[PDB]
Design a protein around this ligand. Structure first.
Ligand SMILES: O=C(O)C(=O)CCCP(=O)(O)O
Length: 428
């Protein structure tokens, strides 16, 4: 496979280099040099294969000769140790549940997949994985790389800006895990991570790399659950599919488009965000003006500067698609709560993030079309809110319960790269 820096089309790297390097020069994201296209027949055939084998093929389509599809099947079978079932919410709406993994969030798929690739590509090479999180990614990465003798992870997250349970899920591990509560929002956290890649001294010293969607391995793996979703739907709807994706940093939606660019039939995509509507407002007047981040019920989506947006623009550009074809909507918390109330009424328990997607989908799903909204995380990860918003008690899954009472081990640091750099050089 070949990749290029969105900031420098001449700076190119293979899949192996992209996976171990993470970021390109000048903090630029890597983009697939070639956009493979399966045929209608192949697509039709892939959908009949089991989840694991299908995912392997999709991935091989990009990776190419670098890694034999056979080996790729083994690594994927190890990573995707859980399903991605579609739950019928309404007669014309389905919810792609992506929280059946070890951390109850879709970050599990790409998180574990990357772990597999890195260990396969780099083996036991000493590596420091610096990742920024707004709630879920941190947990998926912390668990995916826990115990790996050659690996040491450092997660940055906005202090007090994520849910209690989300924090407990990855800030009470210790050992191989190191967590940092930054005095700022997610954006500042991601900026600090990216900034670390301009520090040649630091990169080489710690063998820097990132598990955020920044890493091509993260992006690609997420393309797989879209196919799995369609494969569960009846042929009848296969040509009238509308997918709503609760977006924050937009890595999920990006993977959705890539799936379509591969040949997966998707009538229309909807980018559902919360009050942090930098994208929605952009798609409306073409003016890019991010507002200061605002903490909401869907904290994992409190992103004002989606780092993956450039990857979406490049895909539309190269695929020759018109952005006006992209559905979008900004949902506030009041609407979120009431939307959660509705879903419960319909007989489906959901949470803030998924509610935002459903709201946009429900308000844009035309007759004759089947709608899908991604359940990006288990509602229990936001027990407090869900209980008070739904007015009903909620039991805690084993994955959360076994760490709800454990002590936090997070360090506190201001939004200063100098402070972070020192702490990292103190916890080698
Ligand atoms: O951190 C989280 O839980 C996010 O959903 C957003 C940004 C991280 P990503 O780049 O891995 O998607």
């Amino acid at each position: 496979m070949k990749l290029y820096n969105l900031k420098d089309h001449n700076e190119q790297v293979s899949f192996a280099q992209a996976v171990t390097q993470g970021l390109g020069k000048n903090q630029g994201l890597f983009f697939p040099h070639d956009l493979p296209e399966f045929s209608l027949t192949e697509i039709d055939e892939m959908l009949k294969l089991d989840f694991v084998t299908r995912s392997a093929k999709i991935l091989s389509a990009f990776i190419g000769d670098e890694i034999p599809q056979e080996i790729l099947e083994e690594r994927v079978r190890a990573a995707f140790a859980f399903p991605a079932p579609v739950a019928n919410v309404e007669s014309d709406v389905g919810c792609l549940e992506l929280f059946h993994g070890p951390t109850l969030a879709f970050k599990d798929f790409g998180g574990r997949f990357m772990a597999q690739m890195l260990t396969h590509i780099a083996g036991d090479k000493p590596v420091t994985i610096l990742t920024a999180t707004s709630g879920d990614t941190g947990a998926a990465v912390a668990h995916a790389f826990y115990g790996l003798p050659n690996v040491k992870v450092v997660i940055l997250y906005p202090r007090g800006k994520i849910s209690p349970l989300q924090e407990k899920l990855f800030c009470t591990l210790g050992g191989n895990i190191e967590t940092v509560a930054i005095d700022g929002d997610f954006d500042a956290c991601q900026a600090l991570v990216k900034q670390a890649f301009d520090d040649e001294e630091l990169k080489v010293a710690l063998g820097l790399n990132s598990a955020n969607s920044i890493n091509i391995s993260r992006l690609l793996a997420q393309i797989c659950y879209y196919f799995e979703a369609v494969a569960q739907l009846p042929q009848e709807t296969r040509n009238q599919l509308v997918v709503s994706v609760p977006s924050g940093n937009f890595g999920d939606l990006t993977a959705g488009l890539l799936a379509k660019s591969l040949g997966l039939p998707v009538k229309r995509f909807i980018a559902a965000t919360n009050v942090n509507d930098t994208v929605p407002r952009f798609l409306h007047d073409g003016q890019w003006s991010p507002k200061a981040t605002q903490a909401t019920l869907s904290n994992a989506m409190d992103v004002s500067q989606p780092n993956n947006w450039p990857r979406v623009e490049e895909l539309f550009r190269r695929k020759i698609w018109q952005l006006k074809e992209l559905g979008y909507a900004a949902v506030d918390d009041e609407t979120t709560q009431q939307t959660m109330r509705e879903l419960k009424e319909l007989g489906y328990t959901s949470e803030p993030h998924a509610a935002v997607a459903y709201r946009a989908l429900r308000d844009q799903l035309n007759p004759g079309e089947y709608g899908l909204f991604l359940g990006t995380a288990h509602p229990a990860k936001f027990k407090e809110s869900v209980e008070a918003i739904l007015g009903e008690t909620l039991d805690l899954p084993k994955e959360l319960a076994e760490r709800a009472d454990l002590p936090l081990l997070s360090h506190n640091l201001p939004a200063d790269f100098a402070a972070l750099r020192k702490l990292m050089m103190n916890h080698q």
